[PDB]
Enzyme design. Structure first.
Site, mmCIF file in Angstrom:
data_model
loop_
_atom_site.group_PDB
_atom_site.id
_atom_site.type_symbol
_atom_site.label_atom_id
_atom_site.label_comp_id
_atom_site.label_asym_id
_atom_site.label_seq_id
_atom_site.Cartn_x
_atom_site.Cartn_y
_atom_site.Cartn_z
ATOM 1 N N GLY A 105 63.345 27.423 -29.863
ATOM 2 C CA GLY A 105 62.149 28.210 -30.120
ATOM 3 C C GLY A 105 60.986 27.316 -30.486
ATOM 4 N N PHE A 137 59.530 26.394 -33.456
ATOM 5 C CA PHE A 137 59.691 25.408 -34.545
ATOM 6 C C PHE A 137 61.128 25.004 -34.804
ATOM 7 C CE2 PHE A 137 55.594 27.507 -35.821
ATOM 8 C CZ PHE A 137 54.798 26.436 -35.482
ATOM 9 N N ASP A 153 54.013 35.871 -29.833
ATOM 10 C CA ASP A 153 54.651 35.341 -28.626
ATOM 11 C C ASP A 153 55.632 36.361 -28.029
ATOM 12 O OD1 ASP A 153 55.153 33.713 -26.464
ATOM 13 O OD2 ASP A 153 56.478 32.362 -27.529
ATOM 14 N N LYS A 193 65.504 24.961 -33.374
ATOM 15 C CA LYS A 193 66.547 25.074 -32.356
ATOM 16 C C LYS A 193 67.659 25.962 -32.905
HETATM 17 C C1 LIG Z 1 64.745 30.919 -27.463
HETATM 18 C C2 LIG Z 1 64.968 31.651 -28.774
HETATM 19 C C3 LIG Z 1 64.438 30.879 -29.947
HETATM 20 C C4 LIG Z 1 64.172 32.945 -28.659
HETATM 21 C C5 LIG Z 1 66.364 32.097 -28.951
HETATM 22 N N1 LIG Z 1 67.334 32.060 -28.064
HETATM 23 C C6 LIG Z 1 68.429 32.633 -28.681
HETATM 24 C C7 LIG Z 1 69.723 32.874 -28.233
HETATM 25 C C8 LIG Z 1 70.029 32.487 -26.945
HETATM 26 C C9 LIG Z 1 71.287 32.709 -26.439
HETATM 27 C C10 LIG Z 1 72.229 33.305 -27.229
HETATM 28 F F1 LIG Z 1 73.468 33.531 -26.717
HETATM 29 C C11 LIG Z 1 71.922 33.692 -28.517
HETATM 30 C C12 LIG Z 1 70.657 33.478 -29.057
HETATM 31 C C13 LIG Z 1 70.299 33.843 -30.351
HETATM 32 C C14 LIG Z 1 71.236 34.488 -31.296
HETATM 33 O O1 LIG Z 1 72.397 34.721 -30.987
HETATM 34 N N2 LIG Z 1 70.745 34.814 -32.540
HETATM 35 C C15 LIG Z 1 69.473 34.563 -32.943
HETATM 36 C C16 LIG Z 1 68.596 33.983 -32.139
HETATM 37 C C17 LIG Z 1 69.015 33.614 -30.815
HETATM 38 C C18 LIG Z 1 68.108 33.021 -29.964
HETATM 39 N N3 LIG Z 1 66.787 32.675 -30.125
#
Ligand SMILES: CC(C)(C)c1nc2c3ccc(F)cc3c3c(=O)[nH]ccc3c2[nH]1
Length: 286
Positions: free
Chosen positions: A19, A21, A134, A23
């Site tokens: 994201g 700020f 965003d 990871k």
């Molecule tokens: C790119 C971003 C910061 C929005 C983000 N990607 C993920 C994410 C991506 C694949 C996945 F299987 C789970 C997640 C995930 C998650 O499981 N929890 C919170 C945030 C988040 C997330 N937050």
């Protein structure tokens, strides 16, 4: 009442996403032992002062939000080596719409239901006097039941009490309304513009060749930030808009265009969008 996860019991499984700020990675939290799967988001390496303050703001905001369509805050973990907290959240295993939509067969009614859920989470967010800043398909996540959870609150802000806008590095300019680009004002209605772009992304199934950056960069070119924002502002003020996606109903395209009114005060509210999307979802459902 606070919830503290102990690093002593966190076992890393895999990386999930990056994201603004922080990871995000997947962990098993096992103070016994297996235990619960959780997502842990940590301040990026080589974060400067501006990044640490953005990250602090993100945690402070998410700690206060509590809703079925906002990614669930579970607690925090101290990282004494980073002098920073790590954010612990529910694990939503289907990831973002940006990565999900290109890989699955999804109908119009399902896409409109996703949109409704986004509007529900956003109506709640605005209720609480925050703006997201965003709102894009990359930041809309899906749980195992395909329920929408809005994520990456990295750019989110509290709108100063008494006002309808927040006065504003690298911004997601291709999701931004003209008032943001030109006036440095982010209204609640500015998130509605961004929702319109997100709806466009849903209806194009997050096809990169049709993406908002692809469409605008075709017209503006790669250029410095200032020139990019100037050129983008000019196009938008002159009425240039993203095209109707193939197979998108006229009334759904009109909805997008209404979210993209140049004048912020003419756009619908998220509260109003909920029944609008509910109505069109039911229509194209059967
Ligand atoms: C790119 C971003 C910061 C929005 C983000 N990607 C993920 C994410 C991506 C694949 C996945 F299987 C789970 C997640 C995930 C998650 O499981 N929890 C919170 C945030 C988040 C997330 N937050």
């Amino acid at each position: 009442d606070p919830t503290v996860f102990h690093k002593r019991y966190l076992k890393k499984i895999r990386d999930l996403g990056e994201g603004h700020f922080g990871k995000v990675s997947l962990y098993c939290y096992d103070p016994t032992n297996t235990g619960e799967m959780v997502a842990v988001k940590a301040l990026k390496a080589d974060a400067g002062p501006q990044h640490r303050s953005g990250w602090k703001q993100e945690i402070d905001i998410l700690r206060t939000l509590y809703h079925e369509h906002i990614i669930k805050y579970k607690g925090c973990c101290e990282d004494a080596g980073a002098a920073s907290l790590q954010l612990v959240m529910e694990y939503v295993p289907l990831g973002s719409l940006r990565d999900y939509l290109p890989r699955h067969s999804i109908g119009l009614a399902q896409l409109l239901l996703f949109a409704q859920q986004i509007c529900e989470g956003m109506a709640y967010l605005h209720a609480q006097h925050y703006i997201h800043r965003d709102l894009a398909a990359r930041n809309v996540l899906l749980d195992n039941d395909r329920l929408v959870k809005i994520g990456d609150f990295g750019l989110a802000k509290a709108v100063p009490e008494g006002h309808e806008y927040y006065r504003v590095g690298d911004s997601p300019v291709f999701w931004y309304a003209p008032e943001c680009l030109k006036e440095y004002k982010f209204y609640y209605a500015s998130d509605v513009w961004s929702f319109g772009v997100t709806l466009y992304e849903l209806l194009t199934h997050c096809d990169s060749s049709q993406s908002p950056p692809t469409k605008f960069l075709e017209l503006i070119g790669i250029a410095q930030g200032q020139m990019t924002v100037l050129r983008l502002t000019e196009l938008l003020e002159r009425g240039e808009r993203l095209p109707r996606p193939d197979k998108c109903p006229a009334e759904v395209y009109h909805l997008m265009k209404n979210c993209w009114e140049t004048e912020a005060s003419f756009r619908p509210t998220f509260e109003n969008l909920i029944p609008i999307l509910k109505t069109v979802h039911e229509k194209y459902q059967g």
